[PDB]
């Protein structure tokens, strides 16, 4: 009977395993680790190498000598935490010594540097170690921290409390917690109705930004001029570095899509839909003046910039803007006009779809469209601006030392204090930016960890800040991800979110294994799309980048789901199939809040649709519970349980209780609350336990289902100020 359905008490055996593995601050640690193991290297390699060329006067010896010098950055190293005492000696440093001597719990950052030299005469370049760069503060309990592989008895000897959970830094002896910052997800197409007094009635916006590398915060607006009842309703778009909004047509022409109808094919996918097509006639009339690719680029080039007078100059510009500043996600490469044209057309399709009252205006408050910037990405943002600060100070040195041939001394070149004190400042003060000249910088990003009570400490490491439509309200999308009660009263009410117990935040994976997988599984590339040939084609996106289309999504979706539930596709990756809209969006993306749910399958030889997890797995876990071989990961790879973010939640159907919401009806207690039914035969998932919708503080409230809504909101604020033993140490 090891394949018997699971009861309601059994959901706790799964919850036990979730916490045995993840702990209460998996988000804080998993973020930092990702930044140390991967993110750090990629930051050293984006701009990385810098060169200086000294080309002569070509008069006569000692002239006519052209040289080019290189400086390259290879592997990045990072020691265990250390300290440099006054008397030279460097030695290991444990968290307790840091807190008492007010030191910083940081470790050394070391990078392989190489310095090449080249030379030519009056075209042929011919050729003629590990350096310390800074001290990076470590987050306690992370991979790099001493306390990570520490046993219980170990911690006690180290004068640390085993109940301490890590997730903070130690800067000058005070504990500091990075607060997750909530921002709107980028590379996302959103349509909004521009209010009653406006020339423009609707706008299609895309906040395009790179996953890493400079991060061009250029937002493209696709504007529908004219109001509901105004003649000549044209569509123009505001392009980065271009003062005026160019009529869509000219953009397509400048892209290479020259005749109307070839242009129309990219926007409207149904040749039948006369309604949308009539709406495009004004645009065609607007772009009638420009007839070829060249004249389109000139028209774009005319409208500066400044203007930048000269015919050859303006046409050359528009080329650069379309390549480097227009739709920078997708590609910033050359020959990708086809990709960026179809995207613009997908945007115009969405702009018109909303204006034709077929789709709703985008919910600016949908949680699925929000990201959380944790300790990882926060340090990554800071380290970028701090490493480009160092990179361009070495260059200033290479000029100073090639002028006087003063022997390019390494220690004089790299200023360690740049990155060391640059991070120490942020973490200490809290103005997340460079440096003692901060504003606007975002203060309160780093703050001193609440140590009043143990619960107070826990709830501080799960706190979310939202800076600046109706944000304070509890959204439906906040279900299972954020606590409905734990929020402040006054000013910050509903802008300070607290994570539910089972909530985790996507660390950010690689998109290529999925893009490579897709093409191989029937995905026709956008570069060869012919809308009227395959008109029912499901459009496939990976991080707001339209990669192509697929003819039988039904089978593809099942393959991709089996890929995740096996482990082949990472479980933190979100994949959604909106059948009605004919779309398949995939997210490898960092910052997405997810929750784990039980998987339910129609798949059962014996009877109905039943929860994959059986009483045999439950005992298989409680066997491992008695041992203190079957972990949470074990349930995850056996595809019994899955991770679902808010966007994916949209397409699923969840049962609250397993047992109570599974077998149909073939007296009743009056004292129990009135409950609904398991009418659904469609159930894709089941709720592990509904109490998990609550955060750390609300989870101490006895019978919160018997209190008036705010009385609960009050307790999850007061318990933070209740006295008790905060730590055994």
């Amino acid at each position: 009977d090891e394949s018997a359905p699971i009861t309601a008490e059994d959901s706790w055996a799964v919850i036990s395993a979730f916490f045995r593995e993840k702990g209460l601050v998996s988000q804080q640690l998993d973020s930092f680790n990702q930044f140390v193991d991967y993110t750090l290297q990629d930051i050293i390699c984006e701009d990385s190498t810098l060169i200086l060329e000294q080309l002569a006067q070509h008069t006569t010896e000692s002239d006519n000598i052209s040289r080019k010098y290189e400086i390259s950055f290879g592997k990045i190293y990072v020691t265990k935490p250390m300290v440099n005492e006054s008397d030279g000696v460097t030695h290991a440093l444990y968290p307790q010594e840091a807190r008492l001597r007010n030191l910083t719990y940081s470790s050394g950052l070391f990078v392989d540097v190489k310095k090449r030299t080249y030379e030519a005469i009056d075209e042929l370049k011919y050729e003629l170690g590990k350096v310390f760069i800074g001290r990076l503060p470590i987050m306690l309990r992370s991979k790099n921290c001493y306390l990570s592989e520490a046993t219980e008895s170990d911690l006690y000897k180290l004068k640390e409390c085993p109940f301490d959970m890590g997730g903070y830094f130690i800067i000058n002896g005070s504990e500091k917690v990075l607060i997750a910052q909530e921002r709107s997800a980028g590379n996302i197409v959103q349509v909004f109705k521009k209010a009653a007094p406006s020339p423009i009635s609707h706008v299609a916006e895309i906040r395009s930004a790179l996953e890493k590398g400079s991060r061009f915060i250029s937002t493209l607006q696709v504007k529908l001029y004219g109001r509901e009842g105004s003649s000549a309703r044209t569509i123009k778009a505001t392009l980065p570095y271009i003062k005026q909004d160019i009529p869509i047509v000219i953009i397509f022409r400048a892209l290479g899509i020259i005749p109307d109808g070839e242009i129309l094919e990219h926007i409207c996918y149904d040749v039948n839909d006369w309604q949308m097509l009539e709406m495009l006639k004004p645009c065609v009339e607007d772009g009638f003046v420009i007839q070829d690719r060249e004249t389109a680029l000139d028209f774009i080039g005319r409208r500066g910039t400044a203007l930048g007078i000269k015919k050859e100059k303006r046409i050359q510009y528009a080329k650069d803007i379309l390549q480097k500043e227009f739709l920078p996600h997708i590609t910033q490469l050359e020959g990708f006009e086809s990709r960026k044209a179809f995207f613009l057309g997908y945007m115009i399709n969405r702009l018109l779809l909303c204006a034709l009252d077929r789709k709703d205006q985008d919910d600016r408050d949908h949680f699925g469209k929000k990201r959380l910037d944790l300790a990882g990405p926060l340090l990554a943002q800071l380290f970028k601006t701090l490493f480009k600060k160092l990179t361009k100070d070495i260059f200033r040195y290479m000029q100073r030392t090639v002028e006087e041939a003063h022997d390019f001394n390494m220690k004089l070149a790299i200023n360690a204090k740049t990155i060391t004190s640059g991070l120490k400042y942020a973490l200490a003060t809290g103005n997340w930016g460079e440096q003692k000249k901060a504003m606007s910088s975002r203060a309160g990003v780093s703050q001193v960890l609440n140590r009043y009570t143990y619960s107070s400490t826990l709830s501080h490491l799960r706190r979310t800040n939202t800076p600046i439509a109706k944000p304070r309200q509890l959204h439906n999308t906040h279900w299972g991800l954020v606590c409905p009660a734990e929020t402040p009263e006054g000013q910050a009410c509903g802008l300070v979110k607290n994570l539910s117990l089972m909530s985790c935040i996507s660390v950010g994976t690689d998109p290529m294994p999925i893009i490579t997988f897709l093409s191989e599984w029937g995905m026709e590339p956008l570069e060869d799309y012919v809308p009227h040939q395959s008109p029912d084609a499901t459009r496939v996106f990976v991080n707001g980048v339209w990669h192509g289309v697929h003819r039988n999504p039904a089978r593809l979706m099942e393959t991709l789901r089996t890929l995740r539930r096996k482990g082949d596709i990472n479980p933190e990756v979100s994949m959604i199939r909106d059948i009605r809209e004919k779309e398949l969006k995939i997210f490898t993306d960092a910052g997405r809040v997810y929750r784990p749910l039980f998987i339910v399958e129609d798949d059962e030889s014996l009877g109905h649709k039943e929860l994959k997890v059986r009483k045999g797995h439950i005992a298989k876990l409680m066997a491992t519970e008695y041992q203190d071989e079957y972990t949470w990961s074990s349930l995850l790879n056996e595809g019994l349980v899955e991770y679902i973010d808010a966007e994916e939640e949209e397409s699923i159907l969840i049962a609250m209780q397993p047992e109570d919401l599974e077998p149909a009806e073939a007296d009743v207690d009056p004292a129990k609350r009135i409950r609904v039914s398991h009418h659904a035969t469609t159930f894709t998932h089941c709720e592990i336990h509904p109490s998990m919708i609550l955060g750390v503080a609300a989870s101490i409230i006895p019978f919160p289902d018997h209190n008036q809504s705010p009385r609960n909101t009050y307790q999850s604020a007061m318990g933070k100020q209740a006295m008790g033993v905060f730590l055994t140490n």
Partner: protein, 122 residues
């Protein structure tokens, strides 16, 4: 299974390494809308020149010109299969694919003047 049927199979010479134009076999693609007919007394002549590099294609004057631009790549790739008199096939990889990429024309004594008129509009 058993083959009660017959199959005609030809040997494929996986691309010969050494070819005079081993290096360049390219695809020139025209959209059907362009309606280019190779069998035209007019299109007897044709010149293909790099524009200084998009390719420029032109017939005798008075005839349309096309511009050729290079398409983006992918994991799969295209090969050109040709058949010798003997059934054997020789395959050659496509170096580049260009979408052409021509004229109209009727774009002279205009464009700049039309935009100006449009400006006399606002």
């Amino acid at each position: 299974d058993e083959d009660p049927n017959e199959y005609n199979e030809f040997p494929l010479r996986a691309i010969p390494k050494e070819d005079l134009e081993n290096m360049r076999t390219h695809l020139l693609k025209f959209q059907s809308k362009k309606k280019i007919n190779p069998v035209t007394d007019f299109h007897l002549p044709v010149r293909l020149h790099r524009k200084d590099y998009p390719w420029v294609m032109e017939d005798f004057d008075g005839y349309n010109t096309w511009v050729g631009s290079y398409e983006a790549g992918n994991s799969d790739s295209y090969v050109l299969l040709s058949v010798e008199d003997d059934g054997s096939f020789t395959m050659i990889p496509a170096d580049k694919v260009y979408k052409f990429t021509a004229r109209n024309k009727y774009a002279t004594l205009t464009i700049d003047e039309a935009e100006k008129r449009m400006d006399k509009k606002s």
